[PDB]
Design a protein around this ligand. Structure first.
Ligand SMILES: [K+]
Length: 422
């Protein structure tokens, strides 16, 4: 029987979450650039950087959330195209470093906003998240209007300009995260797996202009098979060697899989990316259900530990006592809806039922601690984007279908030894 006291259906709940989370990128875009704000605080207080700072990677997630919105008629095609034109216009004029983008710009100036003294140039991980988004928009518009196709061409030129091979630091068989015109290679961070950065290696192999040999992946990312290290965490099998420990924060299951489709995905180092990321999600869920630190509210209907704002600032929360600060981040469980739908939907209903303190005007706020009575009315692009995109991927497979249709992406996957058997 229908009633005001009966719960939203899953579909109406997901619709509502998607509309609001889309509105984060649509209504709360930085007005000058059109890009995703790194952070947005309903309380108006910004102790560690303002809302005018725009994030390259977060904007990549956001443009995918916006694609989802165009496809559902949240906004018109025409409105959608005008936004894409604005975003691409900014990218064509903002600071770039060997065709890669910085982590942050000031949206009002187009100039790099450093994090700390030496990280004032290119960030290739962020570039990779931006490009994963941009290549999906290219495919959405490849057979569109003359105007949409024009925009797609401008994206293809940005894509072509990224010099992935530069970031090998003199032709080494690995990718470095950063490069600065001023400080060069001093950040010195070669990127080895497993962590959130797979899509970087895949896009580097995919580039039809400044692409890298397969050796860069096999030796650099996978370290000649060292990336394979089967072990159990919370009684659950993980196949991969996780950087810095036995597992990691849940976003590692998510960022590189917004456009790259994990379903039926395999390569030399993993017989199913889907199964691995599902199990990572289940390790996270299991730690929260066990709740060894006796935090309030953890359980089957409330789990999900990842990097986010935290009671004492910002922390890389994860399913290990050391990393558990009593803070649940909605993006963790919700962005894993593709891997664990029933379980992620249980969390989504339960969080929605907490009301205003957790579910705000642009969707779920970043993080909360029931134990600490800590409920910030604050958002981050990088936590918001994956909720909208992964809900869509579960519902229609939109972003996967678009990304995976890109002929360069296909060639990069073939070159690295990936196969898809669904
Ligand atoms: K109802």
């Amino acid at each position: 029987k229908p009633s005001s006291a009966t719960s939203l259906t899953d579909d109406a709940l997901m619709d509502t979450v998607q509309r609001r989370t889309f509105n984060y990128f649509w209504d709360a875009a930085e007005p000058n650039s059109g890009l995703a704000r790194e952070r947005y605080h309903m309380d108006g207080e910004y102790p560690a950087g303002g809302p005018e700072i725009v994030t390259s990677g977060g904007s990549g997630f956001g443009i995918m959330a916006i694609l989802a919105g165009i496809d559902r008629g949240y906004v018109s095609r025409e409105e959608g195209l005008r936004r894409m034109e604005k975003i691409v216009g900014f990218l064509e004029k903002a600071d770039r470093f060997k065709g890669a983008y910085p982590h942050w710009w000031n949206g009002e100036t187009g100039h790099v906003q450093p994090f700390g003294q030496k990280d004032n140039g290119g960030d290739l991980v962020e570039t990779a998240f931006l490009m994963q988004g941009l290549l999906a928009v290219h495919q959405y518009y490849a057979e569109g209007s003359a105007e949409e196709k024009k925009l797609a061409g401008r994206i293809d030129k940005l894509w072509r300009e990224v010099d992935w091979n530069w970031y090998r630091h003199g032709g080494q068989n690995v990718l470095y995260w950063h490069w600065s015109p001023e400080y060069g290679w001093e950040m010195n961070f070669p990127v080895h797996g497993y962590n959130e950065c797979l899509i970087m290696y895949i896009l580097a192999a995919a580039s039809p202009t400044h692409g890298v040999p397969a050796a860069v992946y096999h030796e650099g990312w996978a370290q000649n098979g060292a990336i394979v290290s089967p072990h159990k965490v919370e009684g659950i099998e993980l196949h991969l060697r996780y950087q810095g420990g036995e597992a990691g924060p849940l976003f590692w299951a998510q960022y590189s899989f917004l456009g790259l489709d994990p379903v039926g995905l395999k390569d030399e180092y993993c017989p199913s990316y889907f199964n691995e990321m599902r199990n990572l999600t289940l390790v996270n869920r299991e730690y929260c259900i066990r709740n060894p630190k006796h935090y309030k509210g953890y359980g089957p209907d409330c789990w999900g530990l990842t990097a986010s704002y935290s009671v004492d600032g910002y922390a890389a929360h994860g399913p290990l006592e050391r990393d558990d600060r009593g803070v649940i981040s909605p993006t963790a469980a919700l962005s894993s809806i593709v891997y664990t739908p029933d379980q992620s939907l249980q969390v989504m209903h339960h969080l929605y039922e907490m009301g205003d303190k957790v579910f705000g005007p642009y969707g779920f706020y970043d993080a909360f601690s029931e134990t600490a009575d800590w409920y910030p009315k604050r958002y981050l692009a990088i936590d918001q984007g994956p909720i909208a995109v992964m809900i869509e991927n579960y519902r229609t497979g939109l972003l996967w279908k678009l990304f995976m249709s890109h002929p360069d992406v296909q060639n990069g996957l073939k070159k690295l030894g990936f196969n898809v058997k669904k």
